[PDB]
Amino acid sequence: SSTVIAFGDPKAQKKWSSELAVDIRKKSYFESRFIGTSENAVIQRKTEVESD
Amino acid sequence: SSTVIAFGDPKAQKKWSSELAVDIRKKSYFESRFIGTSENAVIQRKTEVESD
């Protein structure tokens, strides 16, 4: 014969990839540019109930 | 008459050319520009199994 490690034999080593594929976060439109406590900001912040 | 060395006579010497025309190999789209490691390559290569 001739030595064969075959495919499904328990002696056939397998290696796992350490690095993960990820689903990139969906880019959020309302970033820090808009939400601002100043008047000239699309989404104003009310700071009344933060410390009270 | 006149000595005619006709087209089909065995004495009609030919001369084969040294230069050999060659088909140009198909250009490959997936050069090293795409095939690269890391996340940002269209066709990434897993380097885990290269040495182990």
Distance between CA B2 and CA B30 in Å, rounded?
65
How far B42 CA sits from the closest chain A CA (Å)? 13
User: A41 CB contacts (<8 Å, ≥6 apart)?
Assistant: A34, A35
Name the structure determination technique: cryo-EM
Distance between CA B15 and CA A4 in Å, rounded?
55
DSSP B1: -
Phi, then psi, of A19 in degrees rounded to 5: -85, 135
Please report residues of A whose CB lies closer than 8 A to that of B46.
17
**A15 in reach of chain B (CB within 8 A):** yes
Resolution (A): 3.7
Using an 8 Å Cβ cutoff, are B14 and B22 in contact? no
Distance between CA B34 and CA B44 in Å, rounded?
8
User: A18 CB contacts (<8 Å, ≥6 apart)?
Assistant: B48
